[PDB]
Amino acid sequence: TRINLTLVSELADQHLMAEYRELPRVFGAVRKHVANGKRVRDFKISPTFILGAGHVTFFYDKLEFLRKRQIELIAECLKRGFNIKDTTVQDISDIPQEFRGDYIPHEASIAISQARLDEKIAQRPTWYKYYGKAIYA
Q: Which of 6, 10, 19, 22 is catalytic?
A: 22
Helices and strands (DSSP H and E) totals, the chain:
5, 0
CA pair distance 22, 125, nearest whole angstrom: 22
**Is 22 among the catalytic positions?**
yes
Q: How many domains does one find in the chain? A: 1
Report d(CA 98, CA 42) in Å as an integer.
12
**Cα 100 to Cα 129: distance, rounded to the nearest angstrom:** 34
Task: Report how this structure was experimentally obtained.
Answer: X-ray
Nearest to 124 by CA among 113, 136, 111, 112: 136
User: What's the gap between Cα 97 and its chain centre?
Assistant: 20
Question: Which DSSP category does 130 fall into?
Answer: B
| Residue 71, domain extent | 1-137
Query: Is 1 a catalytic site residue?
Result: yes
Q: What is the resolution of this structure in A?
A: 1.5
Distance CA(120)–CA(36), nearest Å, equals 36
Cβ-defined contacts of 53-58 (< 8 Å, 24+): 55/1, 55/2, 55/3, 56/1, 56/3, 56/26, 56/29
Identify the active-site residue in 1, 6, 57, 72.
1
What single-letter DSSP state applies at residue 60? T
Domain with residue 109: its CATH number is 1.10.440.10
